[PDB]
CSV table of C-alpha atoms and ligand atoms in Angstrom, one decimal:
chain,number,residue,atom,x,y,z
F,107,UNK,CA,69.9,157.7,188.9
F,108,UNK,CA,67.9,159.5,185.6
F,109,UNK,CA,65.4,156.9,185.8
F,110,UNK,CA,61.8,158.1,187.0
F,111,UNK,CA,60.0,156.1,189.7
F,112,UNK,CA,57.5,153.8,187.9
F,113,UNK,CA,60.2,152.9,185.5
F,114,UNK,CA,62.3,151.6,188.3
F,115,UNK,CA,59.7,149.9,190.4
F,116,UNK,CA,59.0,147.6,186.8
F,117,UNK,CA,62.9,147.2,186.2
F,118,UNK,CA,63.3,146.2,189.9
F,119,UNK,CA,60.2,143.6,189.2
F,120,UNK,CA,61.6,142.5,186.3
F,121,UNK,CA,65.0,141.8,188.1
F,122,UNK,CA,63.1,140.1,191.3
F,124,UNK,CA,57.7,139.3,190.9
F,125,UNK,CA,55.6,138.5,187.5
F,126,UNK,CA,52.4,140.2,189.0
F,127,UNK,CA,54.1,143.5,189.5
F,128,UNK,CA,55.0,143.2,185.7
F,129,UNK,CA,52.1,142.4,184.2
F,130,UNK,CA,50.3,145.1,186.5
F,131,UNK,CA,52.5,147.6,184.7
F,132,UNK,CA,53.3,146.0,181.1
F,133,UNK,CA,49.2,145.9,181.1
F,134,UNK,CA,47.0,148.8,179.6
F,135,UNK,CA,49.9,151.4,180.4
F,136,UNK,CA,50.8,154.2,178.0
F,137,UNK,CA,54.0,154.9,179.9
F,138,UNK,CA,56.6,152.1,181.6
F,139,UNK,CA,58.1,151.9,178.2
F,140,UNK,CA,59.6,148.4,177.6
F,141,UNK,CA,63.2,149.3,176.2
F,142,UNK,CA,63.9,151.6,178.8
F,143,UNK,CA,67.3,150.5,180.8
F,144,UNK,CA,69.1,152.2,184.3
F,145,UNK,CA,71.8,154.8,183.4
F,146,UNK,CA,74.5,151.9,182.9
F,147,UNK,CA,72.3,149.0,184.0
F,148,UNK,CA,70.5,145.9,182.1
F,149,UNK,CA,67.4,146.3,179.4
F,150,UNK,CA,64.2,144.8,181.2
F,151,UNK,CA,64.7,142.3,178.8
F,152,UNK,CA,68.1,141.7,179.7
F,153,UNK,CA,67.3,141.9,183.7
F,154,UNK,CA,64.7,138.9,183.2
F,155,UNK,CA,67.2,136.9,181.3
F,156,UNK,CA,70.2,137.3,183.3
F,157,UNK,CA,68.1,135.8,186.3
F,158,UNK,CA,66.0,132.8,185.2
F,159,UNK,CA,62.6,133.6,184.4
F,160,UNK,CA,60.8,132.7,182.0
F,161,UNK,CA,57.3,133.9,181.9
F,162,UNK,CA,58.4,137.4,182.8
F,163,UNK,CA,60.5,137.3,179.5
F,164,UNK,CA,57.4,136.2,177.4
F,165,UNK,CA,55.9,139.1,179.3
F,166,UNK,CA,58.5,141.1,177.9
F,167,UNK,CA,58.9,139.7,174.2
F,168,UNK,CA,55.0,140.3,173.5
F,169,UNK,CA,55.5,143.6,172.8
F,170,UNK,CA,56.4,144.4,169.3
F,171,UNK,CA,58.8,146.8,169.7
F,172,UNK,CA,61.9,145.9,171.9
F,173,UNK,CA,65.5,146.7,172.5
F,174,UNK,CA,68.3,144.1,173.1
F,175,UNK,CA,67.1,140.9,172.0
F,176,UNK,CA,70.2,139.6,170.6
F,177,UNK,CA,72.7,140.4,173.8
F,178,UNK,CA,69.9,138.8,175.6
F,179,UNK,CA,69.7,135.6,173.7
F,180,UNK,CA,73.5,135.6,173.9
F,181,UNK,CA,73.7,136.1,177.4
F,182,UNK,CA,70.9,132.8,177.9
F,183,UNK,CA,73.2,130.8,175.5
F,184,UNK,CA,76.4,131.4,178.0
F,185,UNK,CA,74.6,129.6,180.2
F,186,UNK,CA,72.2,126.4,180.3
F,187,UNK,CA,69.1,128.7,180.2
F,188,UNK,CA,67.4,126.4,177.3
F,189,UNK,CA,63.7,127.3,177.8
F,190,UNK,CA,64.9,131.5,177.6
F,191,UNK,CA,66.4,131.0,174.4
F,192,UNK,CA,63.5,129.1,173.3
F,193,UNK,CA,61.6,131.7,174.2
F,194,UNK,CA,63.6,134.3,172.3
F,195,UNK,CA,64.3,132.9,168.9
F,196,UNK,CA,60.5,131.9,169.2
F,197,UNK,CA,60.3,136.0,169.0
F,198,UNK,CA,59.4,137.0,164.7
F,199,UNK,CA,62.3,139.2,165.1
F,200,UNK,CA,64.6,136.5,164.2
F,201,UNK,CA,62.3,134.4,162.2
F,202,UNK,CA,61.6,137.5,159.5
F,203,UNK,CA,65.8,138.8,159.4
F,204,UNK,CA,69.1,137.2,159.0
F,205,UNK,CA,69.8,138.2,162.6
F,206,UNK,CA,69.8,134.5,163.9
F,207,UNK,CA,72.3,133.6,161.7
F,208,UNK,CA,75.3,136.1,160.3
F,209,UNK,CA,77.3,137.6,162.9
F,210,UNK,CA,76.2,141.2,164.7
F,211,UNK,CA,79.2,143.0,163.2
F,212,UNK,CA,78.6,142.4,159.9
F,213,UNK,CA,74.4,141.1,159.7
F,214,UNK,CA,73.6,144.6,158.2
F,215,UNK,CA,73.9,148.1,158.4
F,216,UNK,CA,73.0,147.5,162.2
F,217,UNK,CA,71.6,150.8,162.4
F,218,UNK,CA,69.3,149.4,165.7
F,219,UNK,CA,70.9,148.1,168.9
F,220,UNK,CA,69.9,144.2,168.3
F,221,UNK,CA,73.3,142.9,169.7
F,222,UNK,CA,74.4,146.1,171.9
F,223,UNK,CA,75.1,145.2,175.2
F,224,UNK,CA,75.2,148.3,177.7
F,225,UNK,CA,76.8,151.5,176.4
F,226,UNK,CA,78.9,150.5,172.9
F,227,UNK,CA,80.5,147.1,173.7
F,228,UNK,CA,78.5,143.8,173.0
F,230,UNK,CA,81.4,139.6,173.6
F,231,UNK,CA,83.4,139.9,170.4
F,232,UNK,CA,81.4,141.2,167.7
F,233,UNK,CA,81.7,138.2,165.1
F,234,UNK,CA,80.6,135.9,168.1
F,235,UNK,CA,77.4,134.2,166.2
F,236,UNK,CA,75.0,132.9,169.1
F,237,UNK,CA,76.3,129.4,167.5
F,238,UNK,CA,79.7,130.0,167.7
F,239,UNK,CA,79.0,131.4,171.6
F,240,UNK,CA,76.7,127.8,172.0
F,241,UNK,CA,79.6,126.1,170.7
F,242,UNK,CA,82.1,127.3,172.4
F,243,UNK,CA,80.4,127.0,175.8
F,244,UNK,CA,79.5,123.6,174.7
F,245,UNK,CA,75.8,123.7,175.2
F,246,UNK,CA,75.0,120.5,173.4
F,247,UNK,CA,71.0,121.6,173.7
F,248,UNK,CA,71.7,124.9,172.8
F,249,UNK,CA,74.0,123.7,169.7
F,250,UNK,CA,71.1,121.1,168.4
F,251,UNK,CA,68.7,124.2,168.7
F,252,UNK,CA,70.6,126.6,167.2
F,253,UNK,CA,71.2,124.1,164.3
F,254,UNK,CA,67.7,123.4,164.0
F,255,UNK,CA,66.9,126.9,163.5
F,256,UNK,CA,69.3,127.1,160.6
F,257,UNK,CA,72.5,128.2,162.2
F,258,UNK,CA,75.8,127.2,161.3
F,259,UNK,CA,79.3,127.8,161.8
F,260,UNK,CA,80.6,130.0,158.3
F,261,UNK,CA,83.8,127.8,158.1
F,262,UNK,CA,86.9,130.5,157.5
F,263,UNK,CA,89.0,130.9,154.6
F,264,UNK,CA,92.0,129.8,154.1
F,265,UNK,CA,95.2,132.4,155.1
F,266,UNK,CA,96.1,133.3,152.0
F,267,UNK,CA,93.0,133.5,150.4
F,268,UNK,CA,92.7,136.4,148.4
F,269,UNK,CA,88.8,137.3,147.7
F,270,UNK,CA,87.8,140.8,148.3
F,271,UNK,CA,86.1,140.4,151.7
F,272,UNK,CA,89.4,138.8,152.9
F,273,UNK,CA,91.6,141.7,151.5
F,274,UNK,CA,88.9,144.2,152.6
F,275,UNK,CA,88.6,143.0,156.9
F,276,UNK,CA,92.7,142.3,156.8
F,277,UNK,CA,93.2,145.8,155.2
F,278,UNK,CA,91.7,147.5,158.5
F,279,UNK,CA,91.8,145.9,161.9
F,280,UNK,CA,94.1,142.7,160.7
F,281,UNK,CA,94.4,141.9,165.1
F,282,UNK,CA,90.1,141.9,164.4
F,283,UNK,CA,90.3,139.4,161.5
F,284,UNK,CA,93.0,137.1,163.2
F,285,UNK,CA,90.6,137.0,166.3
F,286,UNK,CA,87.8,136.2,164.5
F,287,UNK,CA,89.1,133.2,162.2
F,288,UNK,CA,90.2,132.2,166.0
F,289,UNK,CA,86.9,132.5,167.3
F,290,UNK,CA,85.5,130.3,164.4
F,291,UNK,CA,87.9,127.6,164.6
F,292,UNK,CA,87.1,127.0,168.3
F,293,UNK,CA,83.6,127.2,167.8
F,294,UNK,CA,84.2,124.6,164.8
F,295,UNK,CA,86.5,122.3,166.7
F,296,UNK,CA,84.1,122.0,169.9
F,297,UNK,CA,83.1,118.7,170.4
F,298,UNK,CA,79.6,119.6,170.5
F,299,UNK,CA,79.1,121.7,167.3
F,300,UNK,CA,81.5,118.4,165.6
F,301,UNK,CA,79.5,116.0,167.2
F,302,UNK,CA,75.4,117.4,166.2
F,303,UNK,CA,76.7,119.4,163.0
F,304,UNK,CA,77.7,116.7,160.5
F,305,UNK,CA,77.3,113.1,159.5
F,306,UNK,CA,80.7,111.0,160.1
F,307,UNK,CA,81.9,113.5,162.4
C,308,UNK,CA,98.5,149.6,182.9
C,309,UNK,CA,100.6,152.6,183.8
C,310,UNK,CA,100.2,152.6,187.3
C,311,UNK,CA,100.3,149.0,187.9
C,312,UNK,CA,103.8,148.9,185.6
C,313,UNK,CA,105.3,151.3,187.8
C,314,UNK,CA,104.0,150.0,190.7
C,315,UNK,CA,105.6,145.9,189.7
C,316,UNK,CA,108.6,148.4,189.5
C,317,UNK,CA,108.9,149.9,192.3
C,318,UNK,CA,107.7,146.7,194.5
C,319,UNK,CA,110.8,144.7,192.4
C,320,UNK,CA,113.4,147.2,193.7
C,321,UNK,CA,111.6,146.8,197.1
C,322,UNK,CA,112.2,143.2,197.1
C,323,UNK,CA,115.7,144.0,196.0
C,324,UNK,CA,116.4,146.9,198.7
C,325,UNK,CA,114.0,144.4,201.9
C,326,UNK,CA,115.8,140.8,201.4
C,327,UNK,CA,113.8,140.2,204.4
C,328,UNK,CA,110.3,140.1,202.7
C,329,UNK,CA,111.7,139.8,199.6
C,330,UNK,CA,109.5,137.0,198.8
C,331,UNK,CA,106.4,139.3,199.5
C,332,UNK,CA,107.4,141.5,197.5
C,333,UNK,CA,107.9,139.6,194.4
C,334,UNK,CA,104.4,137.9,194.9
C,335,UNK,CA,102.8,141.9,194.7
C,336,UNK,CA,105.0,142.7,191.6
C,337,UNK,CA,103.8,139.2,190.4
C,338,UNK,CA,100.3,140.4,190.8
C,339,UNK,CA,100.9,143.7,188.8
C,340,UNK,CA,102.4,142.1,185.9
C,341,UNK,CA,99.4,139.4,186.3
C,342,UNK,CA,97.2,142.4,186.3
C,343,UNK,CA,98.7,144.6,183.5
C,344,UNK,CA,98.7,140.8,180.8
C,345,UNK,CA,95.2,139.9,181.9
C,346,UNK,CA,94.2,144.1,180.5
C,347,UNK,CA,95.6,143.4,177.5
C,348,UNK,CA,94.6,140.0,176.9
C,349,UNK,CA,90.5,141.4,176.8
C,350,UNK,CA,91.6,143.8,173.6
C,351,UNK,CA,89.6,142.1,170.4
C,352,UNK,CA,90.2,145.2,168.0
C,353,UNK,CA,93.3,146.8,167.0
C,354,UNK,CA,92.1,150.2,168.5
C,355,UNK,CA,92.4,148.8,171.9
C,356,UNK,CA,95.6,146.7,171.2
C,357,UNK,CA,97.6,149.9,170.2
C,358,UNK,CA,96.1,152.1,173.4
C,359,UNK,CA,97.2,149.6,175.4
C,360,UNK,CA,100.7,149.2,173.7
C,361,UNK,CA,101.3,152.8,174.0
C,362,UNK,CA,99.0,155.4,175.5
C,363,UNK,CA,97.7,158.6,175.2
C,378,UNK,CA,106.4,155.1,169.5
C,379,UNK,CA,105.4,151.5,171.8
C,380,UNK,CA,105.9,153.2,175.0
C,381,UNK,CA,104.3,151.0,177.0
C,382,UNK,CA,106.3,148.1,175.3
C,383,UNK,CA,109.4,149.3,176.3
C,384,UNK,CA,108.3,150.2,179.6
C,385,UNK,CA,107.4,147.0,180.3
C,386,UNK,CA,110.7,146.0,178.2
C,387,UNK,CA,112.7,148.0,180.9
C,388,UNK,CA,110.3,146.7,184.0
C,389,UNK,CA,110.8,143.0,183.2
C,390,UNK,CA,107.1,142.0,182.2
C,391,UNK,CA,108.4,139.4,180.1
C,392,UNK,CA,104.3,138.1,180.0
C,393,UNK,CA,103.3,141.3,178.7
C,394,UNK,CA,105.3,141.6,175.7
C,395,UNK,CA,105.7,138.3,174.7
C,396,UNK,CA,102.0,138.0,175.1
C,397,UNK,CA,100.3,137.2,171.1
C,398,UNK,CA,98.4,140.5,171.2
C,399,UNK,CA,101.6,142.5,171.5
C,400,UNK,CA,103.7,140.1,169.3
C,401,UNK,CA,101.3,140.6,166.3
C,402,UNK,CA,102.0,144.1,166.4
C,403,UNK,CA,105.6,144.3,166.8
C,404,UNK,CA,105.8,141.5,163.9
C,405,UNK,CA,103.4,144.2,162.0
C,406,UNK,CA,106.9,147.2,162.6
C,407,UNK,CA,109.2,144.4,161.8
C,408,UNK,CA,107.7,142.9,158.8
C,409,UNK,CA,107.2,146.5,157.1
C,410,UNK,CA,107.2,147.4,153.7
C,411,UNK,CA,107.4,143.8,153.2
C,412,UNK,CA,104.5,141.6,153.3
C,413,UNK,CA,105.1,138.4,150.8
C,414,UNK,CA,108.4,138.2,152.9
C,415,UNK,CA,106.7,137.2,155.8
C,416,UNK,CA,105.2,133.9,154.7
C,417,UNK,CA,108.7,132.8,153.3
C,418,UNK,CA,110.8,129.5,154.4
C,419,UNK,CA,113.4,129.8,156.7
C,420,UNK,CA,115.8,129.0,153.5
C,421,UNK,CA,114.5,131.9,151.4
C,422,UNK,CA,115.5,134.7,154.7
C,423,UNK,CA,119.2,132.4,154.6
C,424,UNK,CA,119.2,132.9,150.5
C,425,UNK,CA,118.1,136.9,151.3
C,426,UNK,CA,120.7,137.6,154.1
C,427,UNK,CA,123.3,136.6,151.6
C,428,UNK,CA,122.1,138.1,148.7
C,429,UNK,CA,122.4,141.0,151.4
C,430,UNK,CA,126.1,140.1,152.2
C,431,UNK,CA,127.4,139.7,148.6
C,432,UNK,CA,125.4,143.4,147.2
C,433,UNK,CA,126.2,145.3,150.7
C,434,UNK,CA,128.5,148.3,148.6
C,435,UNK,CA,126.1,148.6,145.9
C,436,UNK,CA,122.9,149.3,147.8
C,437,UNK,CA,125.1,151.1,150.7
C,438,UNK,CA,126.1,153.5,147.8
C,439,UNK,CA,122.8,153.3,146.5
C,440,UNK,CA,121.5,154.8,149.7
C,441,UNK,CA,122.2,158.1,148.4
C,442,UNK,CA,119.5,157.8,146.4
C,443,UNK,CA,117.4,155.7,148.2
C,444,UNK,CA,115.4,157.5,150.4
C,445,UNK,CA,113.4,158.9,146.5
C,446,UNK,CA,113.5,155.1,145.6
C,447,UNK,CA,111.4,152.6,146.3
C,448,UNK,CA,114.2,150.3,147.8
C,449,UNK,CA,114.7,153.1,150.0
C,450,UNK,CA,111.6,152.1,152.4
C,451,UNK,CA,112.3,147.8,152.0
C,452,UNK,CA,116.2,148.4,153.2
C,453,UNK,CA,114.5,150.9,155.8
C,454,UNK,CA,112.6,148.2,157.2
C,455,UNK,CA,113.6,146.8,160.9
C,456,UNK,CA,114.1,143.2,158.9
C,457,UNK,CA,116.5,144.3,156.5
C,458,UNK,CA,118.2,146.4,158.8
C,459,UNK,CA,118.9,143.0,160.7
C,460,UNK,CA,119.7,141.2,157.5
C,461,UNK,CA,122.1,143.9,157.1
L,501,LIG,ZN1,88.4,135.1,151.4
């Protein structure tokens, strides 16, 4: 327990009260907004896991935030459809390519967009589409699509460009995963059915 | 995964030694092999695939090899591994027919002498790592 006193009275408000927040997300040089227990959730991430939706517009007002992406994959896992409107409604992912290539290989990912609590994140090339998809959140899927997001479809096995030779150089378990990962996001009824025409 | 082997282990020869609660028994081992596939069923990078396949040489392969965890090894994270060892040195190989291994064993079977006395040089050759390979040391 490193965490000083007004820090956890707003993470505990964020988890349970929208007063208490906005009391302390208000005209307060301290209470910083990416601050996170020693192996707990972001503030972001607390409001998201637990359904609350004018607490995480509290939260996504401020400039400056941590965790955005392992919250907007944790709302797409589940049916939360007015939290992930919420957060791609954030200029984050409007002004980047972070809505729409895959954490582990969007950039030199030198901030924590996707991180979830200590290193991990799901599987790195999980898109948020391919996660929609594979939970079969038909909302979630026609959203994600409207915002520009599709499923890359992988190439073939024995293709031979140099991205191909480069990922099944290193980590060939990694690229195997990850062509599985696409193909079940691409074959779930959902993503066939809202994708394409003649599906 | 190394204490739940053991333990599947020593709860089997339990179940061997009761023959009262044998049943009992089974259903804990049962529930440590369960345990030990589910662990390495979550590994998504090779990193984690190998620590778990042999920990801190695929000991824990052949422990499990030895212990009966048929789930374990024959599981797809484990199997794309040991096809990495077998298929070494020889990658094209791989992706060939079912004829073209046939047409290769007995390629194998009619040039056995010449690359058995070619062996002594072998090892500063080239051909010395493909016959060294686990495959072609079944071919042979
Ligand atoms: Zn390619």
């Amino acid at each position: 327990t490193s965490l000083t006193a007004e820090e956890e009275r707003f993470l505990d408000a964020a988890e349970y009260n929208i007063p208490v927040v906005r009391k302390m997300l208000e005209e307060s040089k301290t209470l910083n907004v990416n601050c996170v227990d020693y192996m707990g959730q972001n503030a972001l991430q607390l409001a998201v896991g637990n359904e609350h939706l004018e607490v995480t517009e509290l939260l996504l007002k401020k400039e400056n935030l941590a965790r955005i992406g392992d919250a907007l994959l944790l709302a797409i896992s589940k049916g939360y459809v007015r939290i992930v409107e919420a957060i791609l409604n954030h200029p984050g992912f409007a002004a980047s390519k972070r809505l729409t290539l895959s954490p582990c290989e969007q950039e030199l990912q030198d901030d924590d967009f996707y991180a979830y609590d200590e290193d991990g994140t799901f599987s790195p090339d999980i898109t948020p589409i391919i996660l929609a998809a594979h939970c079969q959140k038909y909302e979630v899927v026609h959203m994600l699509l409207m915002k520009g997001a599709r499923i890359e479809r992988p190439h073939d096995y024995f293709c031979k460009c140099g991205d191909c030779m480069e990922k099944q150089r290193h980590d060939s378990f990694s690229h195997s995963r990850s062509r599985i990962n696409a193909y079940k996001g691409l074959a779930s009824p959902a993503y066939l059915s809202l994708s394409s025409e003649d599906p | 995964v190394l204490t739940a082997l053991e333990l599947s282990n020593e709860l089997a020869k339990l179940a061997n030694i009761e023959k009262e609660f044998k049943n009992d028994y089974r259903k804990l081992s049962m529930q440590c092999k369960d345990f030990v596939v589910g662990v390495l069923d979550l590994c998504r990078d090779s990193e984690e695939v190998e620590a778990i396949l042999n920990g801190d040489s695929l000991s824990r392969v052949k422990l499990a090899i030895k212990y009966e965890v048929k789930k374990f090894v024959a599981h797809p994270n484990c199997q794309q591994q040991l096809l990495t060892i077998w298929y070494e040195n020889l990658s094209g190989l791989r992706e060939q027919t079912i004829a073209i291994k046939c047409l290769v064993v007995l390629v194998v079977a009619l040039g056995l002498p010449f690359l058995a006395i070619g062996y002594w040089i072998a090892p500063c050759s080239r051909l010395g790592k493909i016959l060294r390979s686990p495959f072609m040391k079944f071919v042979a």
